[PDB]
Amino acid sequence: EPWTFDYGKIIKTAKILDISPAVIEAIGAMEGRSYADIREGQGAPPPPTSMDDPRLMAVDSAVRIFLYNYNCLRHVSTFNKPPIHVERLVKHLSYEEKEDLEKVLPNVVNEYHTTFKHLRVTDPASALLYSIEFLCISFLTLYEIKEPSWVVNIVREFALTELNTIIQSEKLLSKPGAFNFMIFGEDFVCSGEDSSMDDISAYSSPGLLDDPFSIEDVDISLDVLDNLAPQ
Amino acid sequence: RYAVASYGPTDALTGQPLDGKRSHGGLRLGEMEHWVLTAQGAMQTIIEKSHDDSDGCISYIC
Amino acid sequence: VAGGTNKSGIVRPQEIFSAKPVEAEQSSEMLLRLKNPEVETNKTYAQEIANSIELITFERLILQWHLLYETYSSTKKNVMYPDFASDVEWMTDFLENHPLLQPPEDIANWCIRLELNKTTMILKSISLESIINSLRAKHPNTYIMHSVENTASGIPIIIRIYLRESAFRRSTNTRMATDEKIAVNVVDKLLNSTIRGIPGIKNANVVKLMRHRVDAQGKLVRLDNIYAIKTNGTNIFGAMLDDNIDPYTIVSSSIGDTMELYGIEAARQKIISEIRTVMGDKGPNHRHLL
Amino acid sequence: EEINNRLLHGDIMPPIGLTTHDFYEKLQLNALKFPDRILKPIMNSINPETNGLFQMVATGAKGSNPNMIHIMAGIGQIEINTQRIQPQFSFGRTLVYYPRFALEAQAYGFICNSYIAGLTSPEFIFGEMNGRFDLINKALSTSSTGYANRKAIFGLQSCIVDYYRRVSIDTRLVQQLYGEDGLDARQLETVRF
Amino acid sequence: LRPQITYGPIETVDNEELTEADMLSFISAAVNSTGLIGYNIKSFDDLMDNGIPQIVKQMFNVDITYKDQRDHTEIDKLRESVQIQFNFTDVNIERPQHRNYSQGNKINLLPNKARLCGLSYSGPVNLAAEVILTAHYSNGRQEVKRASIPPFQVSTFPIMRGSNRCHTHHLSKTAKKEIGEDPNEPGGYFIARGGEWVVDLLENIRFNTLHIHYHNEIIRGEFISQPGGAFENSSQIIIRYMTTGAITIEINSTKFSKLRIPWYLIFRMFGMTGDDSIIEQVVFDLESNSLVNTFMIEILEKSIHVLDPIFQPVQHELNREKIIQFLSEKVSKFVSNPSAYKSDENAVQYLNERQLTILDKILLPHMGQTADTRVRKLRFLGLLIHKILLVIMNVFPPTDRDSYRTKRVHGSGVSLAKAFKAIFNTSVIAPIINGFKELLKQTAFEELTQRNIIEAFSAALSKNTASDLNRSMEQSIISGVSTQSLERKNLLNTISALRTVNTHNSKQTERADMMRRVHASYPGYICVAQSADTGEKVGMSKQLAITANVCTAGEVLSLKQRLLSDPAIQQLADVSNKDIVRKGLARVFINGEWIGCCTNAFELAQRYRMLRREGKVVHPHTTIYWDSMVDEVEFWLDVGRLTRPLLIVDNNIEKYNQACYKAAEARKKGDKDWEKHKIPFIQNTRFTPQMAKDILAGTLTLEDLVAQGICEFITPEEAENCLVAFSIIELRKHKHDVTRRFTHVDVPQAILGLAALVSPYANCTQPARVTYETNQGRQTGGWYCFSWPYRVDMNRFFQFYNEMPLVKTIAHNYVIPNGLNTIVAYMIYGGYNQEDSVIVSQS
Amino acid sequence: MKICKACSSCMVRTYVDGNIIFRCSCGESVQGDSQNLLVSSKVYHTGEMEDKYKIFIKNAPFDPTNCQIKKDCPNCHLDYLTQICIGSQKIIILVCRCGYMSNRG
């Protein structure tokens, strides 16, 4: 099967969330940038060329937390108690239909992991687009569902909440704006480029009951130690 | 070489001579030498050296 | 200085003066005298007895072991590990070779697969038949299958031990142990089982020692052709139970072990003996050891 | 060398309780000891009636037989902790001067030369390995002995002979009679029965 | 690149005429090129010219924020914090100066005046800087004030005598002689408070290497990572395997401390949160059927499901952002109340960016300090865990704590730089921060001008700080960075004190005895005889061999770029973990960082060792180690490697093998005289007797012996790929021995130190007695100093008459003999010489 | 171990009514068929197994620090071989650069 990148899925997905397409395309590349620049798409890094680019892991991590949280809702019955991000909206449900939602909700993890590991080794540039596109099509799959009637309102809310948290988690790694520095609870506030408050003992080489060679129970004057010479 | 005196500089706290030739004090009859003198039975020698010559005094107890 | 014979800079005097227990002794030894005076004359008789008393635990005969979640039924084809699916070929031979050792009806879902070290089986002179009897005499709550004793290199000898349901009925009221925990506890018991020896001793040598004996004419003569056993590691009670060793003349090098089994008076004589050994011959008078 | 040849053909079968490595090391240590014949060339080179070095050793004034052999015949096998020079130089080499898995006895501390003839660089290094132990153990012979000496005295010093020749701790018997004979160590005579 | 030079055939080299006394010229050349303490002067020189400027201009950038604790004002009430930001731009150190009379012009201070007056032989340090102050208002805007400060003197740094900054460096030997200095001494000591102090060489574990030790912890693995250079900050990671089955990674550095983290949390924080990929970085393949991977995965599988009390909330989470936030609020020391900042989304972004900036700069910095190499570090981190698990399985033994393959010898430049870092930020950086804190408290930020800011910077660094910086360095030099007072018993002791390697200062009975012995890695680098013969210091002090040296850091970038440009080496980004174990690739290291893989480890090291011989491409001081046990190639160019020259031995094994093939081919054809096609084996060195005569004439040095491919420098870890003949006779004895093919030939005297070479016929003496002579020869009366009348010394003896021994050694070519040729009778005379006494003629 | 299909996490193995059931933290539950019937295993004498020295034995003919022996190689008829002695039983292996290796391996 020949895979081809589809830009139409990102445009459709971005329109639903009322956000710029550049925000979706910049998953994992938001570090060290202003979100206003990310929103406008200015300063976007070039496509990856190395299989060890942390962007590939960053996008893949965002994909698997969508899948991890989706399956938690899918298997809500098996839990002793559901986690926070899925319990407040399924609370009004009954047990027999809470034991359901694993038959009426389709699986969306069909062939992601196998293909991503192949694309990462073969061509890293296509792997980044594949992981982003997979996140959008999975969101559209969970947003374009229509039957049965009792599940549409419980999954579309989930789809928007998950994709928003993924974007927000990526957003919280960008360049911060302006804020009160004293809300942390202390006077001083250092940065990652500061050396004033570094540990003094850390400048030395890091790292390190009876002494067998110490004359501690031998009462001999320190000025007459030549009596211990081997001779 | 060293040989000092019947008297000389004295430690303020213990009342014993100072340490070694450098301070013009006495020489040490350490832990192992009281073991030997006790083994030999030399008890009047211990009185002469550890009391008369080092810090011996009179304590009054009710 | 090697392990089990550490007589380097002060250790043995520290073991005596600090009254360290037998578990903390790095150079414990023991001298055993054969019960029959005729046997002690011959070296070969003393040589085979010395090799008889040498702790060969079942662990040291094993190259590798595998714990499998399997039950064995003769007719029903139960699931088996794919890497060990070839074991069924010699299982059929075992069933037709032992018409009395049929699999029980309470075999649990736990299998221990063993691959014996054939080199150790040759150097230590341990047969497959001896191992099977030792394990079946000590572990009645297991069912054991084995392959054929082969003399051709490249084909290993496989020991297969099946845990019965009674292995968990021993103590399962203490629910703080899942069935995986008991099975791991059982395999530790199986590996630490004693085969052909007494516990506590790792090496047993043969030495020549000299003794006096009053003749029929009242003459005291030195007998030089007397063989005994000097062991590495100490177990007075272990050699106590042996029928090839004179129990009355067991000489340990452990003060704590002599104290435990003989008393404080024999421990008093043991401290004197052990200090004298450390003191050498240019040592103090005897009254200083008392 | 012929023990090594047996190893190459796999003709060394260790007994029960010994590995092949431990049995091979035992054979090499036994095979690398000077015989009693070593003094035959030594005594033929000296005049016992005029040799100063020999008269110092023979009369017990100073020295011993291994001293003359080391000076004149050869040092022999350097043996630390009753074993040969273990390989600490990169997995099977004792020194940089010998190859990995060397079979010759020289690679494991066998000094073929005497002091009067001089040692080579590898022999001097092996000699320094054993010589350093003497310096280390001499230093320990003070501190380690002092640790044990002080603990022994503080436990034993309370024992004093009373008027019954008993040994007691202020009331409490340690011995019914000192030494079980009541005698002094300085007043003993060695007598045959 | 492939080697191109070719030398003459080894069969035409005439060395049958050589003698052992001719090989002493090789030691002479090695000592002349090396000097005796030249490494000390070089280390202090590149500390002055290169070390301190780099440390100040790179590793002391200050960025802090402080609360505005003023009263009420229009601007005041509306602003909350001020950001102090500054860095140093220009740094230099001058020669020592002294003020003659009062209010003079800082005349020069000669070392003898410093010794006599009890002064300090310290040179001024001048620094320049730019400072930025940013004040933050409540509404959201901020105000920035920037000021450039003219260069000024902060304090004085101690100056080694004889170095580039010493006054006894622009003077002739006669001038040195006549100003109260010793014209024959090389120097290498510091003058402080009228005393002479020697900064000893320090043993230290090799950086960028994994040291695996056993010990509750089952096993432990340490790894100190330095991003390249002797003066860069180092961060260590400790990977522990506990009895509970949990693998924890702990990073000790200037920003973290004693915080043990589950191993998979580190992988998650870098974007790789999938467990299958995380496990793959340790086992290199999930599809391998090898019995090693079964052991590996079983430990890894159990380690994931172990509950960590401190990292409980984020153990089961797969969102990397919250894990970074969880760790950031745990390691940041300015966070006192949780959830007070979580309401503000900008504070969350601040702590996330700060933690990522810290982690990229502190976790394995030798692999890179940017965010690009995050996954690259994870591959290397998984390799470290893989090596540790191989020791738990008992596949490989733990690291030998005594071998010099994993040890470094650090001189005065490295030791003083380490002490400089901890003192500079305390006596300079801290007072400036206090000075600016008080400036902003007493004056509004907007009221400040360019004049006020510069005044506060210099006034804070008053002479309290100037006293602090200089005297703390002197305390580090005096207290001991292990240093000792220079006692001048004689010239031999002065040289031997500067060639002494000290160890760090355990109580373990076995550990305290093993480290005092002579190790198999000592011969050629550490004297096997020189040690203390009495007391606790027996074997605790070590002496460099006569030809041993200490190398400086090389130009690593040249070799790194060439290795990456080598078509035989595949870059790390072009190879997968599965492509490594399935194709059997060989990992290639340079200075401890993993840069790529090669299909043939032996051929790469062989081809680069041959390139080193020319010296035009690979520097002669480059260590090339090939690990035949794990099939890896390592390049080392860091400072602190002991090296000695070894004469290269060449043979004709290539022609010998072809003769064997031709002889066999002739026999298979039925020919009878098949043996006639064989040729004898010949191994020989290219050192000719003419070269020895040229060394003595001064027309042949060690540098151009290396340039001709005759001798090369060998490092203790590189010495493990060498088979060395102990003398030119052993090489000649095995000249036609094909079963013993040496790679180098040694000069026998190269294994002893300078003090151990004084004893004549030391090989004929009991080896323990050679150790005594090293101690006794260093406390011998003699001409203890050539400038004794100019010195006021305590407890010094100047023996009037000295004699060269009738049986001299090579050690007397470099130090003055101390003693007399007394006529000695070996006799019994009256019993007054018994028990190690002597009878002395009164005349 | 068993890796979850959904989230690629390490699934927890438990035992129910004569079957091995893997359950994940995301609720996904699967049952192993044949390859997951391996609770635990251990290998003894790991310090002298043949898989330990495979790389070292392969590299031995090219390492110049290994001990040589005067014996003819039966493959290339080279008159010297490389002799190595590995293990606690002192197993002797003769290797050559052409690929020959005693013990037939």
Ligand SMILES: [Mg+2]
């Ligand atoms: Mg003396």
Ligand SMILES: [Zn+2]
């Ligand atoms: Zn899962």
Ligand SMILES: [Zn+2]
């Ligand atoms: Zn061949």
